[PDB]
Amino acid sequence: QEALHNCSNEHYPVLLSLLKTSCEPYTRFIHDWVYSGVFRDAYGEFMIQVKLYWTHGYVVFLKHIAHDIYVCGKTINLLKL
Amino acid sequence: VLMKRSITAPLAAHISLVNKAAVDYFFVELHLEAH
Amino acid sequence: MIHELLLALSGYPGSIFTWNKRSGLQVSQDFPFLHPSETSVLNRLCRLGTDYIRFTEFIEQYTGHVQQQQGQGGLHGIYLRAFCTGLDSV
Amino acid sequence: LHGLLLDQHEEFFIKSLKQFSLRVEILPSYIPVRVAEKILFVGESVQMF
Numbered sequence: 001q002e003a004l005h006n007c008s009n010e011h012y013p014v015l016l017s018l019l020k021t022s023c024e025p026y027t028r029f030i031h032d033w034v035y036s037g038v039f040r041d042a043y044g045e046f047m048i049q050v051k052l053y054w055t056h057g058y059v060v061f062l063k064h065i066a067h068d069i070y071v072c073g074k075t076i077n078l079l080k081l
Numbered sequence: 082v083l084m085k086r087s088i089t090a091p092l093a094a095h096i097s098l099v100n101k102a103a104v105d106y107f108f109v110e111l112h113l114e115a116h
Numbered sequence: 117m118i119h120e121l122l123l124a125l126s127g128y129p130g131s132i133f134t135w136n137k138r139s140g141l142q143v144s145q146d147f148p149f150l151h152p153s154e155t156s157v158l159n160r161l162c163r164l165g166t167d168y169i170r171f172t173e174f175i176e177q178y179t180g181h182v183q184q185q186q187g188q189g190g191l192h193g194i195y196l197r198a199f200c201t202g203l204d205s206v
Numbered sequence: 207l208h209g210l211l212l213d214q215h216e217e218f219f220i221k222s223l224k225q226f227s228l229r230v231e232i233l234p235s236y237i238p239v240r241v242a243e244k245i246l247f248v249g250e251s252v253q254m255f
Contacts, residue, residue, distance in 0.1 A: 001184070002183065002184070003083040004082070004083055004212055005184045005212070005214060006184075006194070007082055007083070007212065008194060008197075008198070009179075009180075009197065009201070010201075011180070016083070034092070034095070034096075034099075061085075062085075065085075065089055065092070065093065068093065068096050069096075071096075071100075072095075072096045072099050072100070075099050075100060075103050076099065078103065079103060079106075082210065082212060084210075184214070186215055187214075187215030187216075188215075189215070189216055189217075192215070193213075193215060193216040194213060194216055195216065
């Protein structure tokens with residue numbers, strides 16, 4: 001929210017250069033579950049975890065892509081079989 | 082301004098492809114529509 | 117008086133320029149060797165350093181001191197911040 | 207161009223065709239009303255589609 005609230009000052013390239021690499025591991029984590037379906041977590045920054053299918057839990061970026069990620073992981077976890 | 086217009090575009094275009102290919106694998110091989 | 121004038125005009129009040137908020141910068145002007153001639157030129161010079169202090173204090177006070185903690189547009193907001201950014205370069 | 211606004215607790219002489227409006231006091235005197243109408247229409251149209 002420091003990115004959206006001010007973008008018209010000398011701090012904007014500096015804080016953008018901070019956030020741009022501060023979101024690199026989160027995107028690296030997401031690039032596994034969408035392109036191989038492998039889920040990685042040791043930190044608890046996800047609510048997702050790995051009945052007849054229901055052990056997938058839901059107990060950051062905008063919510064407009066998050067639910068699409070949530071279904072595109074389970075699709076590959078079916079395609080693993 | 083910060084928004085995704087160069088990052089989410091090769092991902093949201095990929096989600097639809099995964100969904101469509103998985104549905105296609107169901108239809109022509111397991112024949113759910115015959116049941 | 118020579119290096120001291122620069123020390124005062126830079127925005128750091130000296131030991132001869134008694135800092136006040138009702139007279140600004142002002143010389144003591146009670147030395148036992150005072151010349152009448154030096155008085156007027158010093159009284160003219162003090163005002164610009166007094167103004168420079170308030171300008172720098174204003175710009176520091178209202179630009180770059182918050183991380184988005186109602187709000188006012190003549191104490192905060194982006195237009196006042198743009199005013200201060202132009203002010204320091206002038 | 208989009209319809210986004212990033213000013214919090216400030217205004218930009220513009221406050222769907224609702225929650226955004228032109229008012230005479232916030233507009234500069236050397237920016238007339240005729241240009242502000244076109245800016246308002248363009249923003250509302252791009253926001254709508």
